[PDB]
Amino acid sequence: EAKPKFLSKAEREAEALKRRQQEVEERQRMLEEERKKRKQFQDLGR
Amino acid sequence: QDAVDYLTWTFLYRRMTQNPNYYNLQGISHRHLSDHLSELVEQTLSDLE
Amino acid sequence: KEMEPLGWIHTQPNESPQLSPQDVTTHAKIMADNPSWDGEKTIIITCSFTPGSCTLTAYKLTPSGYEWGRQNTDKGNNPKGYLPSHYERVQMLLSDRFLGFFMVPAQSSWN
């Protein structure tokens, strides 16, 4: 919030790893959604 | 924690929210500011140790 | 890695009111070989050299055009089954409010 807390290096690396996992999961989800949209276009044109 | 509190009083903190790039920062977010403050304070304390 | 492919832009020595069979088949082949190209977002921009001027026009590939291009193999000027329902025109405009950039090959030049 307003006051800055102190975070240890272990906590910081763990938080960064969690954020990286979150973003890679979002990327995989977006890739599967792209696959679904592409399949929709292909079977609409077929 | 008291070290971070003491830093909260200096001028450097005041500018660390307006011109972050000058201080190798990447964002004005509280997360980034806290991470950078913790890193610098831990580094200085480790060097002193 | 952050942007999204939107197609290609190519020059034209002279204006033609219709997208050429070569252009449609090229776009269809590219889309078929590469899943990244979405058939609804990608387009083709044609810059034709009219007298002392460049005329720009944007075209989109319809699913019928995609299928015809992917199945087609003739590279001639008038391939069979090329119909004006294979493409549609999309709205494009110019803007001074931001600047784009270029990206060329590393080892050699492009041409």
- Please report the resolution in angstroms: 3.2
Cβ neighbours of B42 in A, within 8 Å: 9
Give the tokens for residue C65. 């055009």
CB B22 within 8 A of CB B15: yes
Please tell me the total number of residues recorded for chain C in this structure: 111
CB B30 within 8 A of CB A1: yes
Q: For residues C54 and C84, give the distance between their C-alpha atoms in angstroms, rounded to a whole number.
A: 24
Nearest-CA distance B17 → chain A (Å)? 12
| Solved with | cryo-EM
Beta-strand runs (E) in A1-46 = none
| Interface contact A44, partner C, CB < 8 A | yes
Cβ neighbours of A1 in B, within 8 Å: 30
Nearest-CA distance A1 → chain B (Å)? 7
Nearest-CA distance C107 → chain A (Å)? 31
Preferred mutation among A7, A9, A19 to probe B, highest tally of B CBs within 10 A: A7
Preferred mutation among A3, A6, A17 to probe B, highest tally of B CBs within 10 A: A6
> The tokens 């803007």 sit on which residue?
C95
* Helical packing angle, B30-48 and A9-45, nearest 10°: 150
Phi/psi for C88 (5° steps) reads -140, 155
Helix, strand, or coil (residue C12): strand
Q: For residues C51 and C13, give the distance between their C-alpha atoms in angstroms, rounded to a whole number.
A: 11
Question: Could you please report the per-residue DSSP string of C24-83?
Answer: HHHHHHHHHH-TTS-TTT-EEEEEEEETTEEEEEEEEE-HHHHHHHHH----SSS-TT--
